[PDB]
């Protein structure tokens, strides 16, 4: 049924210190290879 | 950084001895030309003045700053070394 009387954004009550970086680590396998500037850094 | 004291030509003479005054320690000189400085618009004017007065002279070419290529955008180069690490 249709309910407009409850808050449905309660998952973040269980988030912790490493939630964001853990999610970032999980996303790594989906990324496309990064482009390259041709050197290790501007100092190479 | 100001460049306004590099507009005109100057004529100066060789530096001679200065010594300490025995009484006060002041800098004494026997050179009457020690403070003499002449201003000229061009090198040619200065050379003509020296020749007619009988002074041997050394002329030195005017040194002009070389034109430079300045680019603010080079500070953030994608792949060059001109990328700055701080602002």
Nearest CA in chain A to B82: A42
* Technique of determination: cryo-EM
Distance CA B25, CA B56 (A): 34
Q: Alpha carbon B86 to chain centroid distance?
A: 35
Give, in order, the Cα–Cα distances in Å from B10 to each of A1, A4, A37, B47, B51.
96, 89, 53, 10, 15
User: Kind and range of the H or E element at B39?
Assistant: strand B38-40
Residue with tokens 């009988």: B54
User: Kind and range of the H or E element at B40?
Assistant: strand B38-40
Residue A39 structure tokens: 């050197």
Give, in order, the Cα–Cα distances in Å from A15 to each of A11, A26, A28.
7, 16, 20
The whole-angstrom distance between A35's CA and the closest CA on chain B is: 11
Residues of chain A with Cβ-Cβ distance to B80 below 8 Å are 42
Residue B74 · residue B43 · CB < 8 Å:
no
User: Within 13 Å and on the Cβ side, how many CA atoms surround A21?
Assistant: 3
Distance CA B87, CA B78 (A): 17
Residue B32 · residue B62 · CB < 8 Å:
no
The whole-angstrom distance between A17's CA and the closest CA on chain B is: 30
Give, in order, the Cα–Cα distances in Å from A16 to each of A4, A19, A28.
28, 5, 20
* DSSP calls for B9-30: EEE------EEE-TTT--EEE-
Both ends of chain A: CA-CA distance in Å?
A: 62
Could you give the maximum distance between any two Cα atoms of chain B, in Å?
69
Distance CA B50, CA B44 (A): 10
Contact: B80, A38; criterion CB under 8 Å? no
Rg, chain A, Cα only: 20
């Amino acid at each position: 049924p249709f309910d407009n009387t409850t808050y449905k954004n309660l998952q973040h009550h269980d988030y912790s210190t490493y939630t964001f970086l853990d999610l970032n680590l999980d996303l790594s396998k989906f990324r496309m290879p990064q482009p390259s500037s041709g050197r290790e850094s501007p100092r190479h | 950084s100001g460049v306004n004291n590099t507009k005109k030509w100057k004529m100066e003479f060789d530096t001679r001895e200065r010594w300490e005054n025995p009484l006060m320690g002041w800098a004494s000189t026997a050179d009457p030309l020690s403070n003499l400085v002449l201003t000229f618009s061009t090198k040619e004017d200065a050379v003509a003045f020296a020749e007619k007065n009988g002074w041997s002279y050394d002329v030195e070419e005017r040194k002009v700053p070389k034109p430079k290529s300045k680019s603010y955008g080079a500070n953030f180069s994608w792949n060059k070394r001109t990328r700055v690490s701080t602002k």
